[PDB]
Design a protein around this ligand. Structure first.
Ligand code: ACO
Ligand code: 5AD
Ligand code: MET
Ligand code: SF4
Lengths: 538, 103, 184
């Protein structure tokens, strides 16, 4: 039978690998796989996961740096776990009578047992459906998969998806957040504060949480509530900078509300990521370029991250009815690629693009995008036109290392200042100028005159993000072929503490952080106050 | 060197030292603490010392037929302009078309 | 003498590349002719339709200024693909702005604005149309859009009813805006 032949082939492969390790010579895996499969008479080849899932323990520890699969999953310095909430209705269904004109799925739809703005056939959607929307099971399952691939899960970040999370009853939000923290740490708590304490003392660090919210649910109350949870990032859907579009699609709010929410969130200390949608109705091929030029040149709009979602028409929505009646037509594919190239050429060097298109399966789409690799096609077109993309994602060491083959040689220090949302922003970085390679970054902001938090009033400057890229280095370990634990963090904080005292004129510095970061900043010399890590500068 | 000179820049990107043209793709220049700073169409910034230099040496540097060595030439963005120079801290301030700053 | 009009002429406009000429008659009519003064079309300015650039929705969810001399204004885009005409509508009694394309077909009509002035100047780069407005306690320079909607403004440093704006005109490379003011 093929099964025992497969097993013997696998065992022989690990035997050769461990022998070669013992006498200490390098070995090529593909040739060994083919040769060993030839002997036992097979019609297939071994899979990497199978070879990983049969190593003895000590050898399992020693020889993972050769059998790892999908090296992109931890090429940015963290491990990402995505979880989903319970199905529910969007808050503006009541006082308007209906929801956005293009959103698919939801509690009242033909997509059975699916969350709003999702179909249920997606990877994460099918993971939570079989788990019946339980945060503990989802976290455990995803961490098990990540460990089975062969990655290190020392540092974790959560992403909470679904509809509007902050519109649910308080008890459910308590349940969800405390279960996430307990799943990481291993405790069995009763409320948020107990879970937060135990997670602070944990060994599997929780770097931060990300939540998606609407501009009318981002006020002082909601911001404070999210501050107690441990959240550090926000996702808001702007979709357009034009006031007529925001009311012809039954969005439910206005652009001025979006700007005010941006101002409050940035003064409180969060990070802002914006969803934008090209090819909206009543928006031609010339208003998109102006839209994005204003987006990146007007101080009221400048965000920290972007998500480009070209418009898709899906069955069971108002836009579907518009499309059937012969009143709405999509762009041609060449025009779409050209537009995306032009848009990507405008992104400033301090902005990071996380995703470039949706992930709806192709057969469910009636019109719109049909391919599945828009980003790389756009990059090739940009190379043809002679322009270049200079965002954050396509300039860091891991991406430059796996897509191209380059390494930093002549690292230098760079600083960029600007004005945004009524505040004076600075962006410090360590990067290689000649090859255009990014290593580590830090964001700093001087608090404006309209801050409401008690801890930040009276002359406080706040640090909003500190990050060093590369592959993941486990805590208290060192790897001379990677970039993390080599002192680029205490160099970036010493400079932030000099700007905040000699230029801002402040007398205190505050940091928003997770929990493992709490221990790190305690090591540096900061103390704890409220949900912040503060330090006197006098 | 040991002689005064008159430096001139036109709006068609031409650089003159005395009566002799020495470069043809310049967009900005400055002189601060016995140092000359230039920005080119090729998206490069250049810094020359003036304490020990001559017309021939400067022309040779800006000869458009010189292989670059990494002490004088540095790469920048597109459409950068020199705002000012801080020699006491060894810094150079630049402005970009969209409006931000850079040091 | 290569042309003649029974009624008087009010304005004459030439394209940025001289291949098309626009004439406005005293009978509220606009004639578009070619370079060789061979008539191409003639149309009445005071129409009653928005155009073909409509607004599609699914349905889910006061007088002209006293110092206005009622002259029409005609402006061309930088590349010559569109043009705009400002005129005092007899129906509403206020100023109205229409935008046409090069093949002389109506594109758009401006939204109702209270206090609109007589000036008009399309940005040569082709992004915004400049005008003027007088509102309670301030005088503003407002910016139109090809769609016919307002998209920005800035404030002049003068008190109410102290000056008047005679003309607006842009620069060659669209960097400087020149404003002409006369004291009342
Ligand atoms: C605060 C926030 O918003 S999050 C920080 C970013 N989140 C991440 O963890 C992603 C990647 N982060 C990193 O690169 C690091 O964790 C940073 C940014 C915190 C520090 O970057 P580095 O340049 O690696 O720090 P640096 O080399 O100066 O410090 C190394 C020391 O920090 C320790 N350390 C690193 N991360 C942590 C942590 N989460 N908790 C406790 N100690 C930590 C290391 O064990 C090492 O201590 P030791 O060698 O003396 O035993
Ligand atoms: C989850 C995000 O998905 C985007 N989104 C919602 N509906 C559509 C659609 N039909 N096509 C493309 N993107 C869409 C919105 O930007 C929302 O914020
Ligand atoms: C999941 S959709 C994006 C979040 C939120 N519903 C919004 O529209 O802004
Ligand atoms: S708010 Fe977001 S999730 Fe809710 S209907 Fe609108 S687009 Fe969909």
């Amino acid at each position: 039978s093929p099964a025992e032949l497969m097993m013997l082939t696998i065992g022989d492969v690990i035997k050769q690998l461990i022998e070669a390790h013992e006498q200490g010579k390098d070995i090529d895996l593909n040739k060994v796989k083919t040769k060993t499969a030839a002997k036992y008479g097979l019609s297939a080849q071994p899979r990497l996961v199978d070879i990983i899932a049969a190593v003895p323990p000590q050898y399992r520890k020693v020889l993972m740096p050769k059998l790892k699969a999908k090296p992109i999953r931890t090429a940015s310095g963290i491990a990402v776990v995505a979880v989903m909430c319970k199905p529910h209705r969007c808050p503006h269904i009541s006082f308007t009578g209906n929801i956005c004109v293009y959103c698919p799925g939801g509690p009242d739809s033909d997509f059975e047992y699916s969350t709003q703005s999702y179909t249920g056939y997606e990877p994460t959607s099918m993971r939570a459906i079989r788990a019946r929307y339980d945060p503990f099971l989802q976290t455990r399952h995803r961490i098990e998969q990540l460990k089975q691939l062969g990655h290190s899960v020392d540092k974790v970040e959560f992403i909470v998806m679904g509809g509007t999370f902050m519109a649910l009853p308080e008890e459910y939000r308590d349940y969800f957040i405390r279960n996430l923290h307990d799943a990481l740490s291993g405790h069995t708590s009763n409320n948020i504060y107990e879970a937060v304490k135990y997670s602070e003392r944990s060994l599997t660090k929780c770097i931060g949480i990300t939540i998606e919210t609407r501009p009318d649910y981002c006020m002082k109350r909601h911001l404070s509530d999210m501050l107690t949870y441990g959240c550090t990032r926000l996702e808001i859907g702007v979709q357009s900078v034009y006031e007529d579009v925001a009311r012809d699609t039954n969005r439910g709010h206005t652009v001025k509300a979006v700007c005010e929410s941006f101002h409050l969130a940035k003064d409180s200390g969060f990070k802002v990521v914006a969803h934008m949608m090209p090819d909206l109705p009543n928006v031609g091929l010339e208003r998109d370029i102006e839209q994005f030029t204003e987006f990146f040149e007007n101080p009221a709009f400048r965000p920290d991250g972007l998500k480009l979602y070209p418009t898709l028409v899906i069955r069971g929505t108002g836009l579907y009815e518009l499309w059937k009646s012969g009143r709405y037509k999509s762009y041609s594919p060449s025009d779409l690629v050209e537009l995306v190239a032009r848009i990507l050429a405008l992104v400033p060097p301090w902005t990071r693009v996380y995703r470039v298109q949706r992930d709806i399966p192709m057969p469910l789409v009636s019109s719109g995008v049909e391919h599945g690799n828009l980003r790389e096609l756009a990059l090739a077109r940009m190379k043809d036109l002679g322009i270049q993309c200079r965002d954050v994602r396509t300039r860091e060491v891991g991406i430059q290392e796996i897509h191209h083959k380059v390494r930093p040689y002549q690292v230098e220090l760079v600083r960029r200042d600007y004005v945004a949302n009524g505040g004076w922003e600075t962006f410090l970085s360590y990067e290689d100028p000649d090859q255009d390679i990014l290593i580590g970054l830090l964001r700093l902001r001087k608090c404006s005159e309209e801050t409401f938090r008690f801890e930040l009033g009276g002359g406080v400057s706040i640090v909003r993000e500190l990050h060093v890229y590369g592959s993941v280095v486990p805590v208290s370990s060192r790897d001379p072929t990677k970039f993390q634990h080599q002192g680029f963090g205490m160099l970036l904080m010493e400079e932030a503490e000099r700007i905040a005292r000699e230029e801002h004129g402040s007398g205190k510095i505050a940091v928003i952080s997770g929990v493992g970061t709490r221990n790190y900043y305690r090591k540096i010399g900061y103390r704890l106050q409220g949900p912040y890590m503060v330090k006197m500068l006098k | 060197g040991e002689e005064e000179c008159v430096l001139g820049l036109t709006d068609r990107c031409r650089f003159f030292i005395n009566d002799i043209e020495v470069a043809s793709n310049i967009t900005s220049f400055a002189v601060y603490d016995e140092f000359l700073l230039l920005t080119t169409h090729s998206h490069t910034c250049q810094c020359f010392c003036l304490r020990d230099a001559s017309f021939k040496t400067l022309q040779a540097g800006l000869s458009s037929n010189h292989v670059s060595h990494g002490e004088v030439l540095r790469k920048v963005e597109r459409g950068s302009r020199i705002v000012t120079v801080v020699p006491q801290d060894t810094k150079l301030v630049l402005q970009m078309p969209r409006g931000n700053l850079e040091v | 003498c290569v042309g003649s009009v029974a009624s008087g002429i009010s304005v004459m406009s030439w394209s940025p590349d001289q291949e098309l000429v626009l004439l406005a008659t005293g009978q509220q009519t606009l004639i578009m002719m070619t370079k060789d003064f061979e008539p191409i079309l003639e149309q009445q300015i005071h129409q009653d339709d928005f155009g073909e650039s409509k607004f599609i929705t699914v349905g889910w969810g006061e007088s002209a200024l006293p110092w206005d001399d009622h002259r029409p204004q005609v402006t061309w885009r930088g590349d010559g693909q569109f043009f705009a005409v400002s005129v005092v509508c007899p129906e509403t009694g206020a100023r109205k702005v229409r935008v046409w394309n090069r093949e002389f077909a109506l594109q758009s009509t401006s939204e109702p604005v209270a206090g609109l002035g007589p000036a008009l100047a399309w940005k040569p780069s082709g992004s915004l149309i400049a005008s003027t407005q007088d509102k309670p306690n301030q005088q503003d320079i407002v910016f139109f859009e090809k769609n016919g909607l307002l998209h920005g403004h800035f404030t002049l440093p003068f008190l109410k009813d102290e000056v008047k704006v005679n003309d607006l005109l842009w620069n060659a490379d669209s960097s400087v805006l020149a404003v002409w003011l006369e004291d009342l």
